[PDB]
Every structure is written in C-alpha cells, then in structure tokens.
Amino acid sequence: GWIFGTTLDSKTQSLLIVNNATNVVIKVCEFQFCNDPFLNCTFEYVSQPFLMKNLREFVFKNIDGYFKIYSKHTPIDLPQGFSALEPLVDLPIGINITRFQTLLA
Amino acid sequence: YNYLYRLFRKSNLKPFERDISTEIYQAGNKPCNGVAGFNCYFPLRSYGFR
Ligand SMILES: *[C@@H]1O[C@H](CO)[C@@H](O[C@@H]2O[C@H](CO)[C@@H](O)[C@H](O)[C@H]2NC(C)=O)[C@H](O)[C@H]1NC(C)=O
Ligand SMILES: *[C@@H]1O[C@H](CO)[C@@H](O)[C@H](O)[C@H]1NC(C)=O
C-alpha cells in the first residue's frame, strides 16, 4: 500500500491505498499514521488488485485535483530495455499532497 | 450564520482542492498556540446574510 498527505496526523485529508490480493481499497479521509498494517470520509474506491524475475513499475502524479496512476508489470535491477506504462486510474481526490510513504505486510 | 467562508490561508488554493482543515492563522511572529488574539485569527468567518 501507500499513504499520501501533507502532515499525516489527522489534521488534513490523507489518501490511503491498500492491496490485499483480492481488491484495491482507496480512501481519502484522515487518521493518525504509524508504520504498516500487521498480519469525515469523502471518497471511497474499490477496484481490482494491482498485483500478479518480475519488475512492477508505477507512476503517481497529482494534476488539477486528479490523482493519476499508471502501471506496468514486465518480466526481466532496472535493465537497459524500454517498456511503456499504461494508465490505470484518474481519481478525483482533490487534496494537497506533499509527502508519502509505503505500506508493507 | 450557517454559512462560513475561508478568509486566511498561508498559500493559494489549487484547482478543485478542498481545504477543510481548521487551524488558527499565524499573521504575526509569536505562535497562537490555539488562542485567537493579536495577529492570530480564526480563518472561517460566517456570512451575515439578512
Ligand atoms: C500543501 O501543503 C504544504 C505544507 O504546508 C504547503 O507548503 C507551505 O507553503 C507555504 C506558502 O506557500 C509556506 O509558508 C510553508 O512553509 C510551506 N510548508 C512546507 C512544509 O513546505 C503547500 O503550499 C500546500 N499546497 C498548496 C497548493 O497550497
Ligand atoms: C470531521 O470530524 C470532526 C471531528 O470529529 C468534526 O468536527 C467534523 O464535523 C467532521 N467533518 C464533517 C464534514 O462532518
């Protein structure tokens, strides 16, 4: 998963993206954050998982209140080849994003 | 007084950005520390429709 936000302390809205090999859960509302999961909310998104030696590349950008996510899974360290990335989503989040972090198992 | 508008902000607003956060504005040098006073104003001001 990933977390995006300005201060990430339940004072401003913070995007949260979670994968669980069954679906993609995306929300925008705020909470206090501490590292990773183990074992007032405006926008909610449920989609298909972004999952499957194998290199997975993602591009995240924030343009005009739109969070755009592109992705590509390829079979192969970054090699010398060339591979394009296809767009997955363009969500209308509309928040101020300046910091982010990753979410492990 | 049911309608409020944002009056003070550190920077301009990006297009289609919602700013629902409510912290006391710092218009001076000394910190407000949650207390409205000199150079320390509440950002949300209520409309006075009559
Ligand atoms: C998103 O939030 C950041 C963090 O507050 C804003 O950056 C601040 O900008 C003001 C004025 O531009 C500065 O006085 C602060 O020092 C900045 N803070 C940090 C931590 O750099 C940023 O302006 C916000 N985005 C928008 C579009 O307003
Ligand atoms: C967000 O939560 C705070 C505190 O619980 C509350 O005061 C505020 O009304 C909530 N926002 C909305 C849009 O209800």
Curated annotation (Swiss-Prot), chain B:
Reported effect, residue 35 to A: Increased resistance to neutralizing antibodies
Ranges where the record places region Disordered: 7-42
Region (Receptor-binding motif), start-end ranges: 1-50
Cystine bridges: 32-40
Effect of residue 5 to F: Decreased HLA binding to NF9 epitope. Increased binding affinity to human ACE2
Region (Immunodominant HLA epitope recognized by the CD8+): 1-8
Result of changing residue 5 to F: In strain: B.1.1.298
Effect in UniProt of substituting residue 42 to S: In strain: Lambda/C.37, Omicron/BQ.1.1, Omicron/XBB.1.5, Omicron/EG.5.1
Subunit structure: Binds to host ACE2. RBD also interacts with the N-linked glycan on 'Asn-90' of ACE2. Cleavage of S generates a polybasic C-terminal sequence on S1 that binds to host Neuropilin-1 (NRP1) and Neuropilin-2 (NRP2) receptors. Interacts with host integrin alpha-5/beta-1 (ITGA5:ITGB1) and with ACE2 in complex with integrin alpha-5/beta-1 (ITGA5:ITGB1). May interact via cytoplasmic c-terminus with M protein. May interact (via N-terminus) with host bilirubin and biliverdin, thereby preventing antibody binding to the SARS-CoV-2 spike NTD via an allosteric mechanism.
Its job: Attaches the virion to the cell membrane by interacting with host receptor, initiating the infection. The major receptor is host ACE2. When S2/S2' has been cleaved, binding to the receptor triggers direct fusion at the cell membrane. When S2/S2' has not been cleaved, binding to the receptor results in internalization of the virus by endocytosis using host TFRC and GRM2 and leading to fusion of the virion membrane with the host endosomal membrane. Alternatively, may use NRP1/NRP2 and integrin as entry receptors.
Protein name: Spike protein S1
Species of the source: Severe acute respiratory syndrome coronavirus 2
Residues of the full protein shown: 449 to 498 of 1273
